[PDB]
Amino acid sequence: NLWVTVYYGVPVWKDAETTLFCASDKKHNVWATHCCVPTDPNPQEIHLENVTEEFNMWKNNMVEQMHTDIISLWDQSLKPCVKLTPLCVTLQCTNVTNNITDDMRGELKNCSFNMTTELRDKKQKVYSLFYRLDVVQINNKEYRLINCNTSAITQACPKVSFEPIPIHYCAPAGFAILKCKDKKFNGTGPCTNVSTVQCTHGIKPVVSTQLLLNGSLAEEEVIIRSENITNNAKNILVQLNESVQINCTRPNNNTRKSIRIGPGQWFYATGDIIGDIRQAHCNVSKATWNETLGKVVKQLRKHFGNNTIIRFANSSGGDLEVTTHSFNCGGEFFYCNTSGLFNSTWISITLPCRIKQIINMWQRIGQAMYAPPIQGVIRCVSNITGLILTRDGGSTNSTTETFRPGGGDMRDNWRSELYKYKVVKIEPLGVAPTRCKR
Amino acid sequence: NLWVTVYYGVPVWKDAETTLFCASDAKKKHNVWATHCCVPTDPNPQEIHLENVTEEFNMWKNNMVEQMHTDIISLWDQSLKPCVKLTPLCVTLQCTNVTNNITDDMRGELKNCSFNMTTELRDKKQKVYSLFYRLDVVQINKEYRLINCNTSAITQACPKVSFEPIPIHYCAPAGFAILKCKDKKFNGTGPCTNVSTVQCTHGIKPVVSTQLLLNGSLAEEEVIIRSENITNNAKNILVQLNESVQINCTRPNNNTRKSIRIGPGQWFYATGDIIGDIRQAHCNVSKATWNETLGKVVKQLRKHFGNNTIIRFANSSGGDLEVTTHSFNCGGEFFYCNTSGLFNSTWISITLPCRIKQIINMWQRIGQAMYAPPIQGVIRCVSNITGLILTRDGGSTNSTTETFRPGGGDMRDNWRSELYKYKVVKIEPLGVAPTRCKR
Amino acid sequence: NLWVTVYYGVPVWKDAETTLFCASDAKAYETKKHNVWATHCCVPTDPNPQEIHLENVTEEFNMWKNNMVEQMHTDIISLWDQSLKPCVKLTPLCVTLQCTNVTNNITDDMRGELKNCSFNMTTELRDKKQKVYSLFYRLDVVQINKEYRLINCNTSAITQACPKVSFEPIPIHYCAPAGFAILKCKDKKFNGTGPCTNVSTVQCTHGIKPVVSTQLLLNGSLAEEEVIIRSENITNNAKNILVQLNESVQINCTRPNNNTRKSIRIGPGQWFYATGDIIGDIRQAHCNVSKATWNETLGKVVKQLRKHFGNNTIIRFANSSGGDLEVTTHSFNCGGEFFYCNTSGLFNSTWISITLPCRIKQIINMWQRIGQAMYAPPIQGVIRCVSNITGLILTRDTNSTTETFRPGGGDMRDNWRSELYKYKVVKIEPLGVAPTRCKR
Amino acid sequence: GFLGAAGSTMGAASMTLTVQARNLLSRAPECQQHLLKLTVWGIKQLQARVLAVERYLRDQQLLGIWGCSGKLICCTNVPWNSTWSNRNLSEIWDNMTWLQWDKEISNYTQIIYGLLEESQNQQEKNEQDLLA
Amino acid sequence: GFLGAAGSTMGAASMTLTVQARNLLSAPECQQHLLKLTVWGIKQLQARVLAVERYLRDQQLLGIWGCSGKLICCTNVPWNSTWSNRNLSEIWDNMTWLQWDKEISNYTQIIYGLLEESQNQQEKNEQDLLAL
Amino acid sequence: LGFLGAAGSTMGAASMTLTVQARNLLSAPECQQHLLKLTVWGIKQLQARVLAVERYLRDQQLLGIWGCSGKLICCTNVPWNSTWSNRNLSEIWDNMTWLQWDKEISNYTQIIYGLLEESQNQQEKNEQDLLAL
Numbered sequence A: 001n002l003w004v005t006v007y008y009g010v011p012v013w014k015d016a017e018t019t020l021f022c023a024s025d026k027k028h029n030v031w032a033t034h035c036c037v038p039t040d041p042n043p044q045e046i047h048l049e050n051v052t053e054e055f056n057m058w059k060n061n062m063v064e065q066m067h068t069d070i071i072s073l074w075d076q077s078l079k080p081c082v083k084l085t086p087l088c089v090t091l092q093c094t095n096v097t098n099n100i101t102d103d104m105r106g107e108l109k110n111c112s113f114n115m116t117t118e119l120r121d122k123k124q125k126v127y128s129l130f131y132r133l134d135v136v137q138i139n140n141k142e143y144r145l146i147n148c149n150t151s152a153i154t155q156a157c158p159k160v161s162f163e164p165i166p167i168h169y170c171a172p173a174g175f176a177i178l179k180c181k182d183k184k185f186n187g188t189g190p191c192t193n194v195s196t197v198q199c200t201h202g203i204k205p206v207v208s209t210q211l212l213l214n215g216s217l218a219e220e221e222v223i224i225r226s227e228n229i230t231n232n233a234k235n236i237l238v239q240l241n242e243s244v245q246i247n248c249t250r251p252n253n254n255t256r257k258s259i260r261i262g263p264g265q266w267f268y269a270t271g272d273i274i275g276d277i278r279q280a281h282c283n284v285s286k287a288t289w290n291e292t293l294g295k296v297v298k299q300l301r302k303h304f305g306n307n308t309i310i311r312f313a314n315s316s317g318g319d320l321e322v323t324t325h326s327f328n329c330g331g332e333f334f335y336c337n338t339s340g341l342f343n344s345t346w347i348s349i350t351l352p353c354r355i356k357q358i359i360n361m362w363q364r365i366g367q368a369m370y371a372p373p374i375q376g377v378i379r380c381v382s383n384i385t386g387l388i389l390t391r392d393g394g395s396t397n398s399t400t401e402t403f404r405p406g407g408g409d410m411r412d413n414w415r416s417e418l419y420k421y422k423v424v425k426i427e428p429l430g431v432a433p434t435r436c437k438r
Numbered sequence B: 001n002l003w004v005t006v007y008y009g010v011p012v013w014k015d016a017e018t019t020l021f022c023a024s025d026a027k028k029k030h031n032v033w034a035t036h037c038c039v040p041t042d043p044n045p046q047e048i049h050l051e052n053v054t055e056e057f058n059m060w061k062n063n064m065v066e067q068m069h070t071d072i073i074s075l076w077d078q079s080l081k082p083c084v085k086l087t088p089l090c091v092t093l094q095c096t097n098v099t100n101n102i103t104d105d106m107r108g109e110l111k112n113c114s115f116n117m118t119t120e121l122r123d124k125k126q127k128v129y130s131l132f133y134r135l136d137v138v139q140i141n142k143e144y145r146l147i148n149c150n151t152s153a154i155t156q157a158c159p160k161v162s163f164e165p166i167p168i169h170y171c172a173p174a175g176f177a178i179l180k181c182k183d184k185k186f187n188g189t190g191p192c193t194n195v196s197t198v199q200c201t202h203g204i205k206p207v208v209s210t211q212l213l214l215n216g217s218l219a220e221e222e223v224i225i226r227s228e229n230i231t232n233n234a235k236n237i238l239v240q241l242n243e244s245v246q247i248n249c250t251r252p253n254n255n256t257r258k259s260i261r262i263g264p265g266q267w268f269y270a271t272g273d274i275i276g277d278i279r280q281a282h283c284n285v286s287k288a289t290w291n292e293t294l295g296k297v298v299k300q301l302r303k304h305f306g307n308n309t310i311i312r313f314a315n316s317s318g319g320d321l322e323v324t325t326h327s328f329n330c331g332g333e334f335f336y337c338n339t340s341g342l343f344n345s346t347w348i349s350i351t352l353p354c355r356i357k358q359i360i361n362m363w364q365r366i367g368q369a370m371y372a373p374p375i376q377g378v379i380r381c382v383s384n385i386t387g388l389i390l391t392r393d394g395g396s397t398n399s400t401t402e403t404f405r406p407g408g409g410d411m412r413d414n415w416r417s418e419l420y421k422y423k424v425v426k427i428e429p430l431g432v433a434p435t436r437c438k439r
Numbered sequence C: 001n002l003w004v005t006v007y008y009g010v011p012v013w014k015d016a017e018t019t020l021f022c023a024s025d026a027k028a029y030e031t032k033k034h035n036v037w038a039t040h041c042c043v044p045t046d047p048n049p050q051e052i053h054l055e056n057v058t059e060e061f062n063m064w065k066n067n068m069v070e071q072m073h074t075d076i077i078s079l080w081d082q083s084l085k086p087c088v089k090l091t092p093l094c095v096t097l098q099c100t101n102v103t104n105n106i107t108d109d110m111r112g113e114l115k116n117c118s119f120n121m122t123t124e125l126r127d128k129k130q131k132v133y134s135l136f137y138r139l140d141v142v143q144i145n146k147e148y149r150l151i152n153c154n155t156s157a158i159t160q161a162c163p164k165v166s167f168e169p170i171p172i173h174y175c176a177p178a179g180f181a182i183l184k185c186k187d188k189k190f191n192g193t194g195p196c197t198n199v200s201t202v203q204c205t206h207g208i209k210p211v212v213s214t215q216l217l218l219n220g221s222l223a224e225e226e227v228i229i230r231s232e233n234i235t236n237n238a239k240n241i242l243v244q245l246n247e248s249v250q251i252n253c254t255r256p257n258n259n260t261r262k263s264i265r266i267g268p269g270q271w272f273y274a275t276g277d278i279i280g281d282i283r284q285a286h287c288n289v290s291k292a293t294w295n296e297t298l299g300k301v302v303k304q305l306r307k308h309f310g311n312n313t314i315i316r317f318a319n320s321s322g323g324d325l326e327v328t329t330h331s332f333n334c335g336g337e338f339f340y341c342n343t344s345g346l347f348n349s350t351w352i353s354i355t356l357p358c359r360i361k362q363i364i365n366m367w368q369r370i371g372q373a374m375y376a377p378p379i380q381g382v383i384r385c386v387s388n389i390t391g392l393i394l395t396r397d398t399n400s401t402t403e404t405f406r407p408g409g410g411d412m413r414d415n416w417r418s419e420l421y422k423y424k425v426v427k428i429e430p431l432g433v434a435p436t437r438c439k440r
Numbered sequence D: 001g002f003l004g005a006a007g008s009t010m011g012a013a014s015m016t017l018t019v020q021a022r023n024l025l026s027r028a029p030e031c032q033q034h035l036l037k038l039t040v041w042g043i044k045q046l047q048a049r050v051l052a053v054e055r056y057l058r059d060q061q062l063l064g065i066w067g068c069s070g071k072l073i074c075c076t077n078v079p080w081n082s083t084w085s086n087r088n089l090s091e092i093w094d095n096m097t098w099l100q101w102d103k104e105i106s107n108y109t110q111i112i113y114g115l116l117e118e119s120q121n122q123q124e125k126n127e128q129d130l131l132a
Numbered sequence E: 001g002f003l004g005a006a007g008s009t010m011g012a013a014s015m016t017l018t019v020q021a022r023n024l025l026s027a028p029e030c031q032q033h034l035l036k037l038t039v040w041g042i043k044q045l046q047a048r049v050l051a052v053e054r055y056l057r058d059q060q061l062l063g064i065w066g067c068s069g070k071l072i073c074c075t076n077v078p079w080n081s082t083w084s085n086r087n088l089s090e091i092w093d094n095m096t097w098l099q100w101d102k103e104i105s106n107y108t109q110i111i112y113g114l115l116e117e118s119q120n121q122q123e124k125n126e127q128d129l130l131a132l
Numbered sequence F: 001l002g003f004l005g006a007a008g009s010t011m012g013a014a015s016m017t018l019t020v021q022a023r024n025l026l027s028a029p030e031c032q033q034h035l036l037k038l039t040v041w042g043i044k045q046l047q048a049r050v051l052a053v054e055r056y057l058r059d060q061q062l063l064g065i066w067g068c069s070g071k072l073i074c075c076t077n078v079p080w081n082s083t084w085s086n087r088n089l090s091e092i093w094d095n096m097t098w099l100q101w102d103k104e105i106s107n108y109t110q111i112i113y114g115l116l117e118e119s120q121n122q123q124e125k126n127e128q129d130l131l132a133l
């Protein structure tokens, strides 16, 4: 004598892929401008008593959206800015040997060129400094900007800030964000401690490679996460439970020149350096780094065997963007040599850095950005919160296993902070039998 | 012994800010406003008198004003967006004076320039000759350049596009209503007794002007002074008049236009030679009408300042041409008229010389300048002065005399003149009240 | 005492205009990515649509005023322009050309129809210049006074179409939004405007290929097995006549010259695709129509045509009236290139293997607009194309005994009117009332 | 069978009215990518979807006002007029195509709608007054 | 007149609930220019979407409270003298609905919470009674 | 308790929380202006909002089709089939959550819905004929 009854408002959800709308708590900050919707002053996390749920960070749709949207914002930021097409001319360059430390001779060049002025008929002589990474030789003194043979270069508007600011992703009505609270969750499988939130915590959109900067720490113990721990074709994301402080700088005291590239437009040129020329570099505490690696190794031993002979080595060859550590400090673009961090086998550190002004903001090509010069001296301090590593393939049963740092899609940085979140949709109609009939 | 009862459709509302629809009379073409403010208004306004309803209006905080400001600028830009750029013309000019049929007033005002510019083919160059007004051209180092070369880009308005103001009606979306204050002699803020509800506002012509307000309402029965704060000398005063003052504005010179091919499919429209004698543009104001009108304003000012206070007017103030003179868009060309002859009196026909400029930063923002194509023939406009924008030059220990100046550099305050009587509210249909029933 | 009864749903409708949406089926990946009609009719079709046989329903289908046609037209214009947005401009090529004749291994029929031009053009850098060489068809080059310029330079800027983009008709289906339905007239001999009894309802139309042509309609329907003549008003000489045939006539078009392409850098991310140099002998483009088939087909049209004229009057056909190239010749777009074929050989008889010479043009004004211009990249190799002639656009214009018909062009709307002559769009209006035996 | 058969008996239509009601209401990421770039097509499609929703709701609101919501067929208290139609059930119910007859009543439709709203207005007051 | 009842007393205003309810949910050349002006297209479209959402929120509440289908419903929640200490004649003593609403103001949220809980408890009780 | 606080609760107890989910499903001008200018983003949000309305209305129409609109709890004239579930009534209303129940009988969702539609049409026709007299 049971009859079908229908209940509307049943607390049941199914996995879903929907658009998230972005919110957050300067005025020229691109992220702050876009995610301008204010957040909940006091978000309410609701613990779900006796709910078990499965999470999979490697297929997390939230990561894919963060990737798509951040790329779009960079394009929107540059969309209204001045093009540098008029500067793609033959350059007449000299060596710049005045007050240069011997170890960096050749990094800077001093080039002159014929630029148009605001009136179309008149021309002007312009002098500007460049890095050797941006300027390429034609066929002794004649050079061109590297992208003259591939793409238009758009300079960034000098007022725009690209400083990472925490961003919170919120569910649209009908959806909810579930999160794991379990410690030591390795990314693929059920978690027992599950809460529901309206928005994620604030995630800073930090763009970097090899070493993840300014993220969260792994509670009380190092967590090694990978899609497949025995597949050398997959990347390993290592989250540290301690931060490592790194001090980076560009010591040269710079000046900015601004010239009349065209009506209503200005081009930003690097002017004479006020003082001596020295290399950009980063400081890593030596003892701290040695302890950090030992901790990572302990966790690798658990996955690969207690024989624990493990070797670290430098990055593979390839393009500058993948082989060196990359970051944006003070608005400047740095590429740093990390071989000094991966020189031990288990059983202060100064990293030299180079500066580049013409930037491919993402792995795609055909568009490029010009980074205007920043005056003064740039120095910043940041936290290393995790690493991206690849286990080398090769002969099996090696007594010594090998790991090397490396890059990959930007998606992988975002997978770290978002590893604990999932989006589901609420489906309110439930049907069950009972004793009630009309 | 009453119980809760819920009623849906109760006549209750709260103040709100929403988007209004732009509607116009359902009847010319190629007019920016008429083309884009496309929703027709054929029904007569459904004005519903509200018996025994008191409501508070505040013109100074009215968001209908802000919304028109934003939409007008936005529409302006969309109109100009697809038109030919004149950036190819920012070249060194070779200029001499026009000495042909020159009187004393226009001597040095009109200048004859020639220059090297492009042709349909990218290999060729041509020499062309055009006239400019002095206000648009700056001397460098006979060598001149257009003034809008170092700070902005210049675009040309499309010759087929008219910017003549036509009536605009703002209409509420469903769920909203517009409350209209019909009290006569109503001051800028406070409660209204004669309140009615309409679906759309009275048509408003988006006339752009400085110092004097034109072709608006007439303040019913008397001169009315409205201000945010009369005491505070940092505020502007909007004064509406109950008599129209006729003003005739003329640009007597007979122009011709030259069509020049700047590039493939592109045209530049240049001012050609003047046919006939050269004379200064000017506007006529009746002497007695102005004198009596101003005296009426003065009486109303004493109403707030005292019967032993002398009221004097001063001739404008220092500053940019756009705010020191009275700007028209007469015939589609831009006049900058001298008002010193209107505001030189002390209380205890008139001809205004005008200058013409073609490169206009119509909005106060900098970076986009529009070039007005010349209009051939002779231009005559006849219009109604319906109000004044006055500044009280206060802030001093001189109770004996107050000084007023014409002024105001912000079009935002022009729309406040017509929208002061309207308010937008949101309808809230659910109400709860007790009565003698229960389930 | 039968009172008002309110019915929520009622099987009724009224004629209505509404925006329709497009669906199509790409059968292959390249089509999905680069075919203009495939990328912008993303929505897949219904794997199994149904037709509902309404019975004892008689309805009017006015094709001349059909909004459905109007939407197809405006939609194709917009789509065409959209496909050209992310493409290289050829503004830098609007320069003086130095041109001579191509005299090497050329038949006299082509003499003067092809020129060898050179010019100074930009390079990757703003300062440096290069001299280049290319060939042009006579139609696109105008002498200025051996100095020439491209014909578009005094009217509009020209954009080169993107080299891998394909503009090739695939079946297109129009589908109704919910609340709307598409009615069809299945009457075998249904004449363009007026009621019919064979009415059915569908969710989507059958596929229509958006084939663009100007005189002869290609790759359409075959008139429900009878030759059918449709027009808005037979009497009015200002109206066009759409004639559908009950069998197809094949037309074999070839562009025999073996072309090559030259890729020229004109800026940092900009390439121009030039016409190259012809390999082998130079011959005239042409189309072949079976003579016997064409004769017989035309005779059938005449027999039906006379139905609305005197039984023994003379039907005279003649070639095109004066007009522009796009009007007087048969514009045939195939293999990626635009042919303008001379059809006078098809309309030179009086009633009571035909070789048509063709011209090639690269600068195109697809929709008869002159505010733009397009440049067609050259196609390498040799083009051979066989099409099905399915119908004609004809113009009739006190000669009690003799009347004259000429082929001619018109608005592209006419091509679509022909294919969509049988469809109508209606709006469903569920509410209604009746007097019945009940009270509250 | 979306339209059923217009030519069927008016009462026969009852069998497909559920179907007609359900058919009033309506995954390739790629269509989404194209529409977002194709701004004008994006707007036209949203407007079409919004219209469908508004039309649906207007009809439901109207049934609500008339006191005919929650059912496919509503008996009301409005007298039938001979000026609208003067035929018995054999002639006007069992022997009619819905479409031809729908057209004739259209003249008088707005009259009927106003009458339906008033009848319900009176009924609601009466029920509130009875429930002392 | 849509707000014609604005000056009416609460009692008198009960006869115009229908006109307001209808108003709440109320050229090719215009369509072409509005679509081109992408921003005006979006602003107007957003307004239409919001109007629908607001309409639905009110209807859902009447559903939740057990008042759907009617413009006027009696409930099973007693009136609290705290919300208003006026008697019936005073409540309807020539007070404009709007004035009265201003007096209740903040008590609205409390009332809704009470109505929602009451209806849910009622449905459980009815489910059990039907089963018996 | 919270919005999905009953998610891990026994099915019976959780029924008294239905009001909150039912309502939640239908729940800074400087920011608005920026995002309005950003056309693509604005379109994505409109699509999201329109769909949310569409889903809501779909569910309401369906309760209408089944004839129990306005209620959170619907009783029927359609019997439960042992084919759909052969579980104990004790198990169904206790010692299980709604999440578990939903996946266990997800295979029959469409069957039940079709049966409910037929039941309602039969009931209305009978009521139409009973009132007629």
Ligand SMILES: *[C@@H]1O[C@H](CO)[C@@H](O[C@@H]2O[C@H](CO)[C@@H](O[C@@H]3O[C@H](CO[C@H]4O[C@H](CO[C@H]5O[C@H](CO)[C@@H](O)[C@H](O)[C@@H]5O)[C@@H](O)[C@H](O[C@H]5O[C@H](CO)[C@@H](O)[C@H](O)[C@@H]5O)[C@@H]4O)[C@@H](O)[C@H](O[C@H]4O[C@H](CO)[C@@H](O)[C@H](O)[C@@H]4O[C@H]4O[C@H](CO)[C@@H](O)[C@H](O)[C@@H]4O[C@H]4O[C@H](CO)[C@@H](O)[C@H](O)[C@@H]4O)[C@@H]3O)[C@H](O)[C@H]2NC(C)=O)[C@H](O)[C@H]1NC(C)=O
Pocket: C169, C211, C218, C219, C332, C333, C334, C335, C336, C379, C380, C381, C382, C383, C384, C385, C386, C387, C388
């Ligand atoms: C109305 O509807 C009709 C359909 O009913 C539409 O007609 C169709 O239209 C399409 C589109 O134009 C055509 O598709 C292309 O066809 C070509 C050629 O194939 C046809 O012609 C062959 C002729 O060769 C034989 O006869 C000649 C006589 O003069 C003789 O000289 C020669 O030696 C030889 O004997 C036929 O053989 C061929 O098969 C036919 O015959 C069969 C007989 O038994 C019969 O059974 C078949 O049914 C058929 O009739 C056919 O008729 C194809 O080459 C072309 O394919 C492209 O893509 C493929 C895929 O990758 C590629 O492999 C090809 O090489 C080619 O791509 C290259 O060439 C393109 C230019 O055509 C160029 O743009 C590409 O970039 C690419 O170039 C690159 O590769 C080359 C390689 O050599 C390299 O060197 C370059 O540097 C570069 O890297 C298409 O399939 C249909 O054929 C046509 N149908 C008919 C019956 O004609 C009609 O369009 C509609 N009407 C309108 C107005 O729209």
Ligand SMILES: *[C@@H]1O[C@H](CO)[C@@H](O[C@@H]2O[C@H](CO)[C@@H](O[C@@H]3O[C@H](CO[C@H]4O[C@H](CO)[C@@H](O)[C@H](O)[C@@H]4O)[C@@H](O)[C@H](O[C@H]4O[C@H](CO)[C@@H](O)[C@H](O)[C@@H]4O)[C@@H]3O)[C@H](O)[C@H]2NC(C)=O)[C@H](O)[C@H]1NC(C)=O
Pocket: A026, A160, A161, A162, A163, A164, A206, A208, A213, A214, A327, A328, A329, A330, A331, A379, A380, A381, A382, A383
């Ligand atoms: C990990 O997290 C750290 C900590 O937030 C980030 O490092 C910070 O980065 C910001 C942005 O570059 C730094 O802020 C800048 O400081 C400059 C120096 O200011 C000194 O002098 C002023 C005097 O008034 C003091 O108030 C101030 O405290 C300092 O002592 C300023 O000159 C900068 O302002 C100028 O540039 C900005 C550009 O956006 C313009 O908007 C301004 O108008 C102005 O022209 C700016 O305030 C901050 O100092 C850094 N802190 C540390 C510890 O490094 C890391 O970058 C982040 N990691 C990664 C990878 O991003």
Ligand SMILES: *[C@@H]1O[C@H](CO)[C@@H](O[C@@H]2O[C@H](CO)[C@@H](O[C@@H]3O[C@H](CO[C@H]4O[C@H](CO)[C@@H](O)[C@H](O)[C@@H]4O)[C@@H](O)[C@H](O[C@H]4O[C@H](CO)[C@@H](O)[C@H](O)[C@@H]4O)[C@@H]3O)[C@H](O)[C@H]2NC(C)=O)[C@H](O)[C@H]1NC(C)=O
Pocket: B162, B164, B165, B207, B209, B214, B215, B328, B329, B330, B331, B332, B380, B381, B382, B383, B384
């Ligand atoms: C306050 O309000 C007044 C009244 O509306 C405004 O003054 C009017 O302004 C309009 C616009 O400039 C004037 O209309 C123009 O009249 C010109 C003269 O027409 C002659 O030829 C016609 C026959 O064709 C005769 O009937 C007529 O008597 C004249 O002999 C026309 O040439 C103008 O049209 C030209 O420009 C338009 C674009 O706008 C093109 O489309 C046309 O093809 C053509 O090239 C135009 O019709 C009107 O006459 C003025 N009225 C008065 C009394 O002077 C004020 O400007 C307004 N004040 C403010 C501050 O805005």
Ligand SMILES: *[C@@H]1O[C@H](CO)[C@@H](O)[C@H](O)[C@H]1NC(C)=O
Pocket: A094, A095, A096, A097, A105, A106, A107, A140
């Ligand atoms: C100096 O010029 C030579 C080429 O003549 C080059 O090889 C060398 O690297 C240059 N030195 C510097 C500091 O640029």
Ligand SMILES: *[C@@H]1O[C@H](CO)[C@@H](O)[C@H](O)[C@H]1NC(C)=O
Pocket: A185, A186, A187, A188, A189, A190
């Ligand atoms: C953690 O890793 C183990 C293998 O050592 C695997 O079986 C388990 O499912 C993983 N759990 C998570 C949450 O990733």
Ligand SMILES: *[C@@H]1O[C@H](CO)[C@@H](O)[C@H](O)[C@H]1NC(C)=O
Pocket: B182, B183, B184, B193, B194
């Ligand atoms: C309101 O209008 C009436 C009639 O127009 C007028 O007499 C009265 O003075 C106005 N002012 C009031 C009553 O608020």
Ligand SMILES: *[C@@H]1O[C@H](CO)[C@@H](O)[C@H](O)[C@H]1NC(C)=O
Pocket: B187, B188, B189, B190, B191, B226, B227, B228, B229, B230, B231
């Ligand atoms: C009148 O306007 C003045 C503006 O200074 C304002 O201070 C005053 O309160 C207004 N009075 C009313 C309520 O009309």
Ligand SMILES: *[C@@H]1O[C@H](CO)[C@@H](O)[C@H](O)[C@H]1NC(C)=O
Pocket: C190, C191, C192, C193, C194, C195, C230, C231, C232, C233, C234, C235
């Ligand atoms: C048949 O076609 C002719 C052509 O104009 C048209 O005038 C006539 O009305 C059509 N007849 C019908 C009803 O199909």
Ligand SMILES: *[C@@H]1O[C@H](CO)[C@@H](O)[C@H](O)[C@H]1NC(C)=O
Pocket: C232, C233, C234, C235, C236, C237
């Ligand atoms: C068709 O055109 C003729 C003139 O050629 C005209 O007399 C006749 O009335 C027209 N018929 C229609 C369809 O209106």
Ligand SMILES: *[C@@H]1O[C@H](CO)[C@@H](O)[C@H](O)[C@H]1NC(C)=O
Pocket: C292, C295, C296, C299, C349, C350, C351
């Ligand atoms: C072809 O058509 C002509 C009429 O133009 C006719 O005289 C001739 O007999 C026809 N030939 C055939 C194929 O019978």
